[PDB]
């Protein structure tokens, strides 16, 4: 006589049954049955200053949309890294060991924001 198709949520079942609705934890339950909220675990909204900002929600219908060109690794590399290496190659002051000079990161460990595995939310 039970309903098999509806979702299992905390509203159903006995009182002992409990489960979350998808909210991220903001603290720890210590011994003695005490909740201890952690300030670092609570997301902080980084909101910029919008004074003097010229961009608004919509755009002029007369504004031309551009040709779609999704960014690629090569496109990023040419814009940022290529000029430095090309200039250094002409001067001859280039070596394999010092790729970090141009912006290469040997490892993501020690960075606050790691690209892989990602350690920051959107």
């Amino acid at each position: 006589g039970a309903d098999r198709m509806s979702k299992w949520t905390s509203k159903r079942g006995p009182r002992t049954f409990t489960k979350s609705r998808g909210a991220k934890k903001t603290g720890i339950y210590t011994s003695d049955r005490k909740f201890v909220q952690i300030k670092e675990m609570v997301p902080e909204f980084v909101v910029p200053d919008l004074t003097g900002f010229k961009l608004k929600p919509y755009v002029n219908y007369r504004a031309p949309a551009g040709i779609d060109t999704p960014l690629t690794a090569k496109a990023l590399f040419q814009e940022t890294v290529a000029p430095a290496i090309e200039k250094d190659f002409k001067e001859g002051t280039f070596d394999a060991n010092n790729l970090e000079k141009y912006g290469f990161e040997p490892t993501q460990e020690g960075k606050l924001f790691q690209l892989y595995p990602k350690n920051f939310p959107r």
Partner: protein, 127 residues
């Protein structure tokens, strides 16, 4: 932010900063009668009452004194032409009590502001 991973926190970890916000909320007219300071919100199911306080104070610069939340169950009783139950989405309601003695009342959107003696014969005929 919803539908994303949070970096796991361990002793000495940095503060969690969400630079772009994924939570979208809507201010709703109270169904029941509420104190003047209280304001109702419908918020994503993954948002906590702590999140709403920071959300409102930081994005909208509104001081908040207290927040309460409840999860409303959506009806699963209505059936479609194939007799399959239609699920109305479960959602979360937030009650925000404003600070500093400020008051709010939901604004009034949408303020507004032939002849009976010759029947059945077309009058077009001039004869």
């Amino acid at each position: 932010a919803r539908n994303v991973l949070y970096p796991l926190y361990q002793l000495g970890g940095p503060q969690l900063r969400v630079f772009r916000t994924n939570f979208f909320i809507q201010l709703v007219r109270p169904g029941t009668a509420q104190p003047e300071d209280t304001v109702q919100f419908r918020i994503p199911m993954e948002m906590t009452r702590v999140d709403l306080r920071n959300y409102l104070e930081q994005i909208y610069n509104v001081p908040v004194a207290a927040v309460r939340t409840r999860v409303q169950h959506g009806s699963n009783r209505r059936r479609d032409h194939k007799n399959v139950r239609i699920k109305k989405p479960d959602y979360k309601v937030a009650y925000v009590q404003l600070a500093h003695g400020q008051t709010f009342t939901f604004p009034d959107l949408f303020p507004e502001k032939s002849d009976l003696r010759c029947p059945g014969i077309p009058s077009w005929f001039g004869l």
